[PDB]
Design a binder for this molecule. Structure first.
Ligand SMILES: [Mg+2]
Ligand SMILES: [Mg+2]
Ligand SMILES: [Mg+2]
Ligand SMILES: [Mg+2]
Ligand SMILES: [Mg+2]
Ligand SMILES: [Mg+2]
Ligand SMILES: [Mg+2]
Ligand SMILES: [Mg+2]
Ligand SMILES: [Mg+2]
Ligand SMILES: [Mg+2]
Ligand SMILES: [Mg+2]
Ligand SMILES: [Mg+2]
Lengths: 224, 68, 81, 118, 129, 195, 95
RNA sequence: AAGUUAAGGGAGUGAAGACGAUCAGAUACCGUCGUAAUCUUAACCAUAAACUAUGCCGACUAGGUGUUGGAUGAAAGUGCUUCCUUCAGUACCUUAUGAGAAAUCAAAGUCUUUGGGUUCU
RNA sequence: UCUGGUGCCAGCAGCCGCGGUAAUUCCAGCUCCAAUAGCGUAUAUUAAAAUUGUUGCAGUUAAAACGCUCGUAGUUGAAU
């Protein structure tokens, strides 16, 4: 859109200086504007667009001197269907503004998800690479790899999140108080986030560093 | 019950709140009672004066820029 | 990962800490990179550099100074460690 | 009480910043200047703004006033504090050191000809 | 009282590895520890190590490569048959593509794939991811 | 180099304090009979020179921020930013400068210099939220948390701070082509001294 | 929920401690829990102090002091305001 | 601790009991008396918020300030005191890509990456 | 959030609950939903239950470390 970038990353993304969103993942840079994520995922020049889903709305009260004081929390889960996933939450006075804020918050937390094989590797990886575990509050979750023809075997919320993430095959089990929706969602998200951090043997070899976009586009950003 | 819906900026007290605000009330007879309707619009900084001339707002002190 | 037809299927390859080899993930904001400039036998900086990467774990524990000292000593840039 | 709200003070501060060369230490002239420069529908608020302008102008004579950026003062202070001494105090003929400092320096193998303890 | 020297060694190695320590010291040593360390060495999970010779039970110092996720023992050394490897590996290992389960066998110490290749059972010692 | 260490001895940069702060053991030579810790002064030169090389590696000088909190370090930091092309703060630090993108003084840099990590705790805390390589100037009691390169000196004496910033600026200029070596920098200390 | 780490008194590596009696209300309290106060008072106020001075022989007289060493129980001590009620963080501040 | 049996002892305190007050009532809180008991010797009883509400043995993991008892090496003393190490006991402070539902915790850590030994519930 | 009747009654409802004139829950009419030559109810039993735990639970404050020590049977024991 016709939006005025506020950060250096926003300026570089507004121009065509950055080719893929995996370039900013590699350097562990923060993202402060949802317009970057909108720019990288458009209905044009993109094979798989994003999707949203309001998964829960719950009211909360504060109980001032003249009675209660209600408002609503909104949880949304965003997903690409291919290696990208996110989760957002927002509290507000009206439901519409809360869901808008949650949609914005989910986009800021989009992360890459790794995928693997059960048995022998063939085209199109289909499941988790190894067992991963996630924890939030008193809720613990565990995901394990499964063969090709299995579906997801889990609670409806797990199926929702894994379908957004792009995983087709998985077993699972859980422990704790999973009737709490927010902690269950956060535990699944934390388990998904751990995939690109495990250091399997095939990642042992050492490589040389690339150069950061700030250094590599210093002069063009100086011209401003 | 009552339901309120707001947007923007509005004033309540003083003499300006009677000049720059436009107000009406109506009622609708539904099958199970009466509902009251109450609308309030602040005009876009547009109000002639009692000594009629287009005024602005009794709350502003813009300072002009020196000529250069 | 390379499948049976020898095609890379990972969407990207993350970095490793130069001190502990700990595979920095995508949200670790306490990880940094240092570039040290080189001299040209006259005392003037040419266009070349050396690079190191440090993870947020060690940097939050407070051993970044000692680890960087050892790493730079390996590269003939310091006389001690 | 006679405390001045933030609207009055902000207007006065901007007026002082933008039109310093004209303003004086007399209330009537500053009232006329404030009539001409700014836009104030009521004469009462105009009187209060002009009064604070005059009060602020009086304070500036005594030194710096915080929140009002007047350049002439700034370059005057910069040229004051940029005085170059003709002799530096960094260089002296004899260095006096501790006994432990002298032992350290002798151990590190660096040579200084003018070191003396105590 | 010790009751086991393998468990203490593996626990110390695991604790040091979690901090990125680049070297660690193992106080009590034995032949079984040497064989376990050699098998970890053969898979490229650690570097070289020394054996310090006092006139008592010796001491070991090892070099670490920032590469081990976990190493532990199974305390009761259960007796495992050749056709029961599948359940144990399904329960214990994180994947079907990496990780090792260590049995002690009438033909020496070896992991589960080599045990299958040699057509032999044994008892369980431990594992490392 | 001999005259640099001679000037360092002219000031009191070699005397620290008590409170060894064990992570700074490798920089301390001995403890005197009065309890003061003596800094090596030979590692100080090498660390300063490495810091200068790291600083000059940065492509433009505007992506460098120098921070001081106490009154007796404002003149030195201002003049150091003047001779180089960096930005200085030298005063009250706003708690959300490096992380709040709506504030009026966001100013995200690439490298950050600290006069003292104990009093500049807020600035070094915010650096770990945005991948900023802090470089510091540490005494015998300074915490080395989120600090990448440490130069061992005393952060209290005004002349010591002035001398260290003067030395660092002179070395940075040498590493460029503004003046070749074998002739000293024409500007003098007492430009960097307080009051 | 264990509002105090030491349980309201300073006892470690012991089983039993002998009690004493409150100087105000007579209750029994263990010696390691009672609050102690030591007082160095004058016999009279300053006006009577000077009045005794010129009614005295020896031309150089000093009145004696009094030494008391009182001890109180919690209820009888914080009713007299030797000790007050503080906040959660301020409670930990000794001295 | 209380309580039971026998012989002593028996000042102060004082379950019971008797009064005097307060109160709408007061078999209570306050006050004046006062029996058993409390102390010693010889026997029973086996229970307490008998509490760190945290069983016992072994290993690993972090910085600082104290203190009680030994030993080692060095300076001011007018064969003693201070300082530096090290062993054993005992507290506190800060911090935790450590843990917990949290309060909090140097163990209540090294746990879905779950198995060092063992008893009780 | 369809119509008529009843009005803390009659009744419904495994559980939370509904029923005083506006009853989305009672009694009926219409319309929709599920399985379908099959579909409900009662009792017993398995999974759900990592709420019996070898794999695999908890014991400061939620239920739960014997008042403390000794001690036989049992279980477990450095390196070569
Ligand atoms: Mg008014
Ligand atoms: Mg007791
Ligand atoms: Mg008697
Ligand atoms: Mg009596
Ligand atoms: Mg009992
Ligand atoms: Mg108990
Ligand atoms: Mg488990
Ligand atoms: Mg059952
Ligand atoms: Mg069961
Ligand atoms: Mg089951
Ligand atoms: Mg249970
Ligand atoms: Mg006990």
């Amino acid at each position: 859109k016709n939006w005025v970038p506020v950060t250096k990353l926003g300026r570089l993304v507004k121009e065509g200086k950055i080719v893929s969103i995996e370039e900013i993942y590699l350097h562990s840079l923060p993202i402060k504007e949802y317009q970057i994520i909108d720019y990288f995922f458009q209905p044009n020049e993109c094979s798989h667009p994003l999707k949203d889903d309001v998964v829960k709305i719950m009211p909360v009260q504060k109980q001032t001197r003249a009675g209660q004081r209600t408002r609503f929390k909104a949880f949304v889960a965003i997903g690409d269907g291919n290696g990208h996933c996110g989760l957002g939450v927002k509290c507000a006075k009206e439901v519409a503004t809360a869901i808008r804020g949650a949609i914005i918050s989910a986009k800021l937390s989009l992360i890459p998800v790794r995928r693997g094989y059960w048995g022998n590797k063939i085209g199109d990886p289909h499941t988790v690479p190894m067992k991963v575990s996630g924890k939030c509050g008193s809720v613990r979750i565990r995901l394990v790899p499964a063969p090709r023809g299995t579906q997801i075997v889990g609670a409806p919320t797990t199926k929702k999140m894994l379908n957004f993430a792009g995983i087709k095959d998985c077993f699972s089990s859980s422990c704790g108080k999973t009737k709490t929706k927010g902690n269950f969602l956060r535990a699944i998200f934390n388990a998904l986030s751990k995939t690109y951090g495990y250091l399997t043997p095939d990642l042992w070899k050492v490589t040389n560093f690339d150069k950061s976009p700030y250094e590599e586009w210093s002069d063009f950003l100086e011209t401003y | 019950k009552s339901m309120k819906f707001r947007d923007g900026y509005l004033i309540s007290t003083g003499e300006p709140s009677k000049r720059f605000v436009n107000t009406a009330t109506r009622s609708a007879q539904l099958k199970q009672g009466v509902l009251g309707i109450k609308v309030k619009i602040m005009l876009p900084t547009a109000i002639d004066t009692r000594t009629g001339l287009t005024s602005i707002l009794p709350d502003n002190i813009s300072v002009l820029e020196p000529k250069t | 990962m390379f499948n049976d037809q020898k095609v890379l299927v990972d969407i990207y390859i993350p970095r490793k800490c130069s001190a502990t080899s700990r595979l920095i993930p995508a949200k670790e904001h306490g990880a940094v990179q240092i570039n040290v400039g080189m001299v040209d036998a006259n005392g003037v900086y040419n266009g070349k550099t050396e690079t190191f990467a440090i993870s947020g774990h060690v940097r939050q524990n407070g051993e970044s100074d000692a680890c960087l000292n050892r790493l730079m000593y390996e590269k003939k840039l310091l006389s001690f460690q | 009480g006679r405390v001045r709200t933030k609207t009055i003070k902000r207007a006065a501060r901007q007026i002082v910043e933008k039109y310093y060369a004209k303003l004086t230490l007399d209330f009537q002239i500053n009232k006329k200047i404030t009539e001409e420069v700014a836009i104030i529908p009521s004469k009462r608020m105009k009187n209060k703004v002009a009064g604070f302008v005059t009060h602020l102008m009086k304070r500036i004579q005594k030194g710096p006033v915080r929140g009002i950026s007047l350049k002439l003062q700034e370059e005057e202070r910069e040229r004051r504090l940029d005085f170059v001494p003709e002799k530096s105090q960094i260089d002296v003929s004899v260095i006096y050191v501790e006994p432990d400092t002298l032992r350290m320096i002798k151990s590190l193998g660096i040579n200084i000809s003018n070191m003396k303890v105590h | 009282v010790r009751m086991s020297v393998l468990a203490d060694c593996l626990k110390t190695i695991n604790n040091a590895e979690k901090r990125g320590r680049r070297q660690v010291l193992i106080r009590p040593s034995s032949k079984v520890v040497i064989k376990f360390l050699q098998y970890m060495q053969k898979k490229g999970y650690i570097g070289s190590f020394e054996i310090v010779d006092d006139h008592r039970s010796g001491k070991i110092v090892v070099n670490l490569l920032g590469r081990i996720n976990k190493c532990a023992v199974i305390s009761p050394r259960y007796d495992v048959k050749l056709d029961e490897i599948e359940k144990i590996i399904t329960s214990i290992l994180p994947s079907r593509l990496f990780g090792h389960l260590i049995l002690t066998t009438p033909y020496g110490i070896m992991d589960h794939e080599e045990a299958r290749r040699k057509h032999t059972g044994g008892k369980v010692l431990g594992f490392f991811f | 180099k001999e005259e640099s260490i001679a000037k360092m001895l002219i000031c009191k940069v070699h005397i620290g304090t008590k409170n060894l702060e064990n992570k700074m053991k490798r920089y301390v030579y001995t403890r005197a009979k009065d309890g003061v810790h003596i800094i090596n002064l030979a590692k100080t030169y090498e660390k300063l020179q490495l810091a200068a090389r790291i600083i000059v590696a940065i492509s433009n000088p505007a992506d460098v921020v120098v921070v001081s909190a106490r009154p007796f370090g404002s003149r030195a930091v201002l003049k150091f930013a003047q001779y180089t092309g960096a930005q200085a703060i030298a005063g009250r630090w706003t708690p959300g400068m490096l992380t709040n993108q709506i504030i009026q003084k966001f100013t995200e840099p690439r490298l950050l210099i600290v006069t003292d990590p104990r009093t500049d705790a807020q600035s070094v805390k915010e650096s770990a939220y945005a991948n900023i390589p802090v470089i510091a100037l540490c005494d015998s009691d300074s915490p080395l948390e989120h600090v990448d390169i440490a130069i061992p000196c005393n952060n209290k004496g005004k002349e010591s701070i002035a001398l260290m910033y003067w030395l660092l600026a002179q070395e940075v200029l040498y590493l460029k082509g503004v003046i070749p070596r074998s002739e000293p920098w024409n500007v003098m200390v007492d430009m960097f001294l307080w009051r | 929920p264990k509002k105090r780490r030491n349980g309201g008194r300073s006892k470690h590596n012991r089983g039993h401690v002998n009690p004493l009696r409150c100087s105000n209300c007579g209750r029994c309290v263990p010696k390691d829990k009672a609050i102690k106060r030591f007082n160095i008072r004058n016999i009279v106020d300053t006006s009577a102090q000077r009045d005794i001075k010129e009614a005295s022989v020896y031309s150089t007289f000093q009145l004696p002091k009094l030494y008391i060493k009182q001890c109180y129980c919690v209820s009888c001590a914080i009713h007299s305001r030797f000790v007050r009620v503080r906040s959660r963080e301020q409670r930990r501040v000794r001295k």
